[PDB]
Write a protein that binds this ligand. Structure first.
Ligand SMILES: CN(CCO)c1ccc([C@H]2NC(=O)c3ccccc3N2)cc1
Ligand SMILES: [Zn+2]
Lengths: 47, 161
C-alpha cells in the first residue's frame, strides 16, 4: 500500500470530464474505514 | 467477533441506506461492460456489521486524524465493492483490500456512486462476471456492497478524467 501525499490523510478523485460522476476517494490505512452496512442486492434489467 | 444484524425494511435506517444506494446510480462510460446495464437495484437485505474490535480500531485512528486536522475527521459514508467483502466484514480493511493499479496509487478505494462500486463486486473491470453464469450483467445472482464509514481527514484534491 502507498502512502497518502505528505500532510494529507486521503486522496479525492474529482471528476473533470464527466459532469454527472460523483467523487471517488482513496485511503492508505485500513484503519480509516469501518464496514458499517452489508447490502445484498440484484441489479434490475431496465424495462 | 463479527455479528450481522438484519434491518427491517420498515426501519428508517434501512430506508435511508437504500435511498443512498438507489439515488447514486449513474450511467458509466463503459456502457455497462464492467457492472452491468441497470438504472436501479432490487435490495434483498441490509445488515448492520457489528464488531467491537474493528470499531475501536476505526475510532482510534479517527481521533488521531481529527487531532491532526483541527478536530475534524472529515468522515463520509461511501460505497465499497470487492470480491473480498466477506473477508472485510470479519477482519477489517487492510493492504490485501487495496487496488494496486488504481488511478491514485495503491490504496483502498471508495465511491459516492453506488454503481461505481458495483463495477468491482466481481473484480477489477467486473472480472469475468458472476461465478455461476460468467455474466458481468447478471440479473439473477446476488451481489453485495459495503456502505462504509470513512475518515478522509485532510484530503489531497486530484482533478482527473
Ligand atoms: C482488492 N482489489 C483488487 C485490487 O488489487 C480491489 C478491491 C476493490 C476495488 C474497488 N472498489 C470500489 O468500490 C471502488 C470505488 C471507486 C473506485 C475504485 C474502486 N475500486 C478495486 C480493487
Ligand atoms: Zn449469475
Amino acid at each position: 500500500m502507498a502512502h497518502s501525499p505528505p500532510g494529507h490523510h486521503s486522496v479525492t478523485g474529482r471528476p473533470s470530464v464527466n459532469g454527472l460522476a460523483l467523487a471517488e476517494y482513496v485511503i492508505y490505512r485500513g484503519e480509516q474505514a469501518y464496514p458499517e452496512y452489508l447490502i445484498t442486492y440484484q441489479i434490475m434489467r431496465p424495462e | 467477533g463479527t455479528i450481522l444484524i438484519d434491518l427491517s425494511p420498515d426501519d428508517k435506517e434501512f430506508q435511508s441506506v437504500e435511498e443512498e444506494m438507489q439515488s447514486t446510480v449513474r450511467e458509466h462510460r463503459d456502457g455497462g461492460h464492467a457492472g452491468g446495464i441497470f438504472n436501479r437495484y432490487n435490495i434483498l437485505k441490509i445488515q448492520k456489521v457489528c464488531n467491537k474490535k474493528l470499531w475501536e480500531r476505526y475510532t482510534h485512528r479517527r481521533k488521531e486524524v481529527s487531532e491532526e486536522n483541527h478536530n475534524h475527521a472529515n468522515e463520509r459514508m461511501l460505497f465499497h465493492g470487492s470480491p473480498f467483502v466477506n473477508a472485510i466484514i470479519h477482519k477489517g480493511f487492510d493492504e490485501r483490500h487495496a487496488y494496486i493499479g488504481g488511478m491514485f496509487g495503491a490504496g483502498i478505494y471508495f465511491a459516492e456512486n453506488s454503481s461505481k462500486s458495483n463495477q468491482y463486486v466481481y473484480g477489477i473491470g467486473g472480472g469475468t462476471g458472476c461465478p455461476v453464469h460468467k455474466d458481468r450483467s447478471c440479473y439473477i445472482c446476488h451481489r453485495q456492497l459495503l456502505f462504509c464509514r470513512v475518515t478522509l481527514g485532510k484530503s489531497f484534491l486530484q482533478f482527473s478524467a
